[PDB]
Design an enzyme around this catalytic site. Structure first.
Site, mmCIF file in Angstrom:
data_model
loop_
_atom_site.group_PDB
_atom_site.id
_atom_site.type_symbol
_atom_site.label_atom_id
_atom_site.label_comp_id
_atom_site.label_asym_id
_atom_site.label_seq_id
_atom_site.Cartn_x
_atom_site.Cartn_y
_atom_site.Cartn_z
ATOM 1 C CD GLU A 65 -2.308 1.208 2.883
ATOM 2 O OE1 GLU A 65 -1.495 1.262 3.824
ATOM 3 O OE2 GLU A 65 -3.561 1.123 3.037
ATOM 4 C CG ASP A 260 -9.279 -0.914 4.200
ATOM 5 O OD1 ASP A 260 -8.372 -0.589 4.999
ATOM 6 O OD2 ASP A 260 -9.261 -1.965 3.519
HETATM 7 O O1 LIG Z 1 -2.286 0.179 6.160
HETATM 8 C C1 LIG Z 1 -3.325 1.011 6.684
HETATM 9 C C2 LIG Z 1 -3.126 1.212 8.170
HETATM 10 O O2 LIG Z 1 -1.880 1.851 8.431
HETATM 11 C C3 LIG Z 1 -4.264 2.013 8.808
HETATM 12 O O3 LIG Z 1 -4.000 2.109 10.209
HETATM 13 O O4 LIG Z 1 -5.485 1.318 8.602
HETATM 14 C C4 LIG Z 1 -5.764 1.157 7.204
HETATM 15 C C5 LIG Z 1 -4.680 0.356 6.468
HETATM 16 O O5 LIG Z 1 -4.980 0.297 5.063
#
Ligand SMILES: O[C@@H]1[C@@H](O)[C@H](O)OC[C@H]1O
Length: 377
Positions: A65, A260
């Site tokens: 990501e 998300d």
């Molecule tokens: O990687 C991300 C994370 O760091 C966040 O805390 O929650 C969503 C995830 O996609």
């Protein structure tokens, strides 16, 4: 007609009254702070001469990501040195050379490059491919591994054809043209749906796959109309192929509006900006802005998609504000201008939880300044 057809990008900061010079100074300062800022602010870390990683500060790991996010920021900001450092790190430590995940990326590793789990995260692969196509179109291909277009084509080949390659699974369900949550499971994550990137995959991917990518763009637009709540505009973190919230999973309850799902409003808005194909996007953008118009950022909670607040606060409230503000690319209701101004007056997040907020923040600063662009040809 969208920015793809016209070459003109909405500068929402300018339209809200900010001066062109203060806007680009603010975008450049946001880059300088996020990549090279102080120890409480930065999320980018150089390694030796030829590598670098984006740190999930909260989880103390490096995620496909964040690496793919960093590559998109770098190519939009014309920062080839940082792009090539991030790409070399992902290529070197994360991309699988063999087995059921061949050409996919391990979704996270230790900052030293030690893989923690081999399984991929599809939102990684699709950002990697889009950022590499933009790197090719902006800068031209270099020698492998910086043969950017061929690298992008390789990733997207695996995304559709992994099942023909070995005992692995594709990242799109061939029957409904929808991106999955993980290759092995028959459900999705609405925030992974990037119809605007699939329109460009239909241009730039391997010829044999271009029809599929075109159908995937149409299918994802339709999917988000089924996934987003028709009153609140809120979407679940994980959703069935019919758009309903997926069942509680062994690793948590993803049925609600949390981390998300914030990216849905941003994704819908950028598709509207680039392609202007689905006018539902305007109403979806108006709906989520109306839902949050009256709610202070420090008061942001977890919500059911029908808008019932939990006691629990948002983990990434600056991230949520950023995605709500990025919705001003499509929203034409009475909240669009206030979200733009609220965002302008909001600084980067500092401390342990800053990574996710600051990634979403930066994409919004790009988009609202008219600097989140398609790089063609
Ligand atoms: O990687 C991300 C994370 O760091 C966040 O805390 O929650 C969503 C995830 O996609």
């Amino acid at each position: 007609k969208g920015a793809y057809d016209t070459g003109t990008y909405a500068n929402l900061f300018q339209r809200s009254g900010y001066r062109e010079d203060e806007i680009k100074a603010r975008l450049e300062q946001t880059w300088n702070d996020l990549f090279y800022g102080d120890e409480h602010t930065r999320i980018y870390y150089p390694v030796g001469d030829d590598k670098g990683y984006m740190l999930d500060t909260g989880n103390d790991d490096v995620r496909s990501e964040g690496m793919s996010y960093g590559m998109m920021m770098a190519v939009q900001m014309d920062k080839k040195h940082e792009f090539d450092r991030l790409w070399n790190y992902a290529y070197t430590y994360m991309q699988h050379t063999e087995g059921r995940y061949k050409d996919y990326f391990a979704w996270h590793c230790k900052p030293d490059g030690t893989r923690l789990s081999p399984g991929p995260a599809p939102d990684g692969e699709e950002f990697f491919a889009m950022a590499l196509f933009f790197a090719s179109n902006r800068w031209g291909d270099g020698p492998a591994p910086y043969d950017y277009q061929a690298q992008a084509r390789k990733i997207l080949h695996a995304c559709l054809h992994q099942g023909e390659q070995g005992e692995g699974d594709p990242m799109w369900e061939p029957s409904n043209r929808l991106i999955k949550f993980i290759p092995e499971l028959p459900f999705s994550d609405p925030s992974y749906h990037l119809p605007h990137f699939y329109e460009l995959f239909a241009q730039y991917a391997n010829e044999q796959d271009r029809t599929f990518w075109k159908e995937a763009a149409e299918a994802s637009r339709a999917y988000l109309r089924t996934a987003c709540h028709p009153v609140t505009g809120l979407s679940p973190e994980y959703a069935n192929y019919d758009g309903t919230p997926a069942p509680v999973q062994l690793h948590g309850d993803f049925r609600h509006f949390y981390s998300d799902a914030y990216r849905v409003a941003a994704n819908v808005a950028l598709d509207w900006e680039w392609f202007r194909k689905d006018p539902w996007q305007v109403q979806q953008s108006n709906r989520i802005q109306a839902f949050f118009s009256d709610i202070d950022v420090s008061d942001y909670r977890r919500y059911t998609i029908e808008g019932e607040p939990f006691n629990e606060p948002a983990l990434h409230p600056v991230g949520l504000l950023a995605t709500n503000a990025m919705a001003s690319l499509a929203a034409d209701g009475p909240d669009a201008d206030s979200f733009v101004k609220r965002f302008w007056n909001t600084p980067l997040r500092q401390g342990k939880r800053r990574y996710y907020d600051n990634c979403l923040y930066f994409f919004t600063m790009l988009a609202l300044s008219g600097n989140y662009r398609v790089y063609q040809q």
